[PDB]
Amino acid sequence: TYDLLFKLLLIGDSGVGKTCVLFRFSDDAFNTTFISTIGIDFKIKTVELQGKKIKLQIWDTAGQERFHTITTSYYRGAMGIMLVYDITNGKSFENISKWLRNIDEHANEDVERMLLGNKCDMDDKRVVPKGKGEQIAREHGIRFFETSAKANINIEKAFLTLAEDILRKTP
Amino acid sequence: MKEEEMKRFCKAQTIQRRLNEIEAALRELEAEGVKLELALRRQSSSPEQQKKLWVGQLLQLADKKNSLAAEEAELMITVQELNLEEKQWQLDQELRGYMNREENLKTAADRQAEDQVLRKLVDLVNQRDALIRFQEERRLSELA
Ligand SMILES: Nc1nc2c(ncn2[C@@H]2O[C@H](COP(=O)(O)OP(=O)(O)NP(=O)(O)O)[C@@H](O)[C@H]2O)c(=O)[nH]1
Numbered sequence: 644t645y646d647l648l649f650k651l652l653l654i655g656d657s658g659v660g661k662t663c664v665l666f667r668f669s670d671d672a673f674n675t676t677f678i679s680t681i682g683i684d685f686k687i688k689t690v691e692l693q694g695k696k697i698k699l700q701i702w703d704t705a706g707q708e709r710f711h712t713i714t715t716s717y718y719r720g721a722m723g724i725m726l727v728y729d730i731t732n733g734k735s736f737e738n739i740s741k742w743l744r745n746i747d748e749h750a751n752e753d754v755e756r757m758l759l760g761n762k763c764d765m766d767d768k769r770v771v772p773k774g775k776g777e778q779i780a781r782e783h784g785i786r787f788f789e790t791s792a793k794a795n796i797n798i799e800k801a802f803l804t805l806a807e808d809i810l811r812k813t814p
Numbered sequence: 815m816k817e818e819e820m821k822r823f824c825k826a827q828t829i830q831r832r833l834n835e836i837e838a839a840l841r842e843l844e845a846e847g848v849k850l851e852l853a854l855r856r857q858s859s860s861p862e863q864q865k866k867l868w869v870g871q872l873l874q875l876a877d878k879k880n881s882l883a884a885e886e887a888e889l890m891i892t893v894q895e896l897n898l899e900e901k902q903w904q905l906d907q908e909l910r911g912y913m914n915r916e917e918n919l920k921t922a923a924d925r926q927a928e929d930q931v932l933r934k935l936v937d938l939v940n941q942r943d944a945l946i947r948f949q950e951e952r953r954l955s956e957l958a
């Protein structure tokens with residue numbers, strides 16, 4: 644039914660859009676009502692890359708601080724991690740440094756890391772210039788995309804790119 | 815959502831209907847195979863052309879049984895997925911009830927109960943993960 648199982652993980656502050664980003668990828672749908680994630684969840688999406696059927700198990704974490712210890716239990720199994728901030732929320736981007744340290748402490752040493760600046764449809768409420776995301780990604784050697792779950796901008800591209808980078812080192 | 819509760823129930827009913835269809839089909843195929851296996855043994859008098867036909871029909875019964883059995887196996891996992899997803903949804907809703915109450919109104923027993931529901935909810939996600947891991951172990955085994 645599939646060739647390979649990849650484990651992905653989404654982390655970042657509460658409200659930045661981790662759950663909507665996943666829902667747009669898994670369902671091609673967007674919902675405006677904020678339902679905060681409680682503890683941990685995951686969804687399954689199977690994709691085809693280079694003739695292989697890749698089952699993605701995508702773990703979605705609670706960004707609320709209360710759930711931090713629950714969420715850190717799930718870093719170590721991840722093969723790729725999306726760090727998500729909100730381009731309209733300056734604090735969400737300042738905390739990316741902290742989320743990177745969490746990956747340093749709890750994830751596997753060779754996990755793939757990808758930075759997502761979400762809500763890129765809110766140009767007129769932007770606080771984080773795209774160049775700051777590009778710069779911190781350059782400083783860590785990681786990929787970076789500005790995304791929008793609402794407008795469906797770079798959602799498929801982000802997830803499929805991360806999956807290709809995992810697949811590229813699979814044998 | 816609440817949409818998702820209904821869609822989960824309907825999908826579970828649909829799979830149960832198909833599982834019932836497969837159970838009936840497998841027992842009919844089994845009876846047919848027994849009948850043709852008996853004809854091959856009893857009727858060695860019979861021409862090779864007729865016995866070649868029975869051998870061919872036995873081979874295609876075998877192919878259909880394997881296909882039905884593979885479909886049944888995948889649906890049985892989906893049944894349990896939907897059961898776990900429904901249980902997680904129930905715990906999610908119960909915990910949001912506790913969470914939406916002002917902290918000033920919570921007794922010590924309320925806070926203990928909320929913690930317990932959160933522990934159960936995380937465990938349900940871990941049960942769903944264990945099912946994913948079961949499928950990956952069967953994938954590895956079926957491959958070899
Ligand atoms: N304009 C806009 N709003 C978005 C976008 N993505 C999410 N939102 C909105 O932002 C809010 C929070 O989204 P959500 O996915 O729940 O964020 P989260 O990171 O999962 N929060 P948590 O960590 O608490 O579970 C919701 O109101 C949602 O509609 C986007 O691309 N554009």
Ligand SMILES: [Mg+2]
Pocket residue numbers: 661662663678679680703704705706
């Ligand atoms: Mg969420």
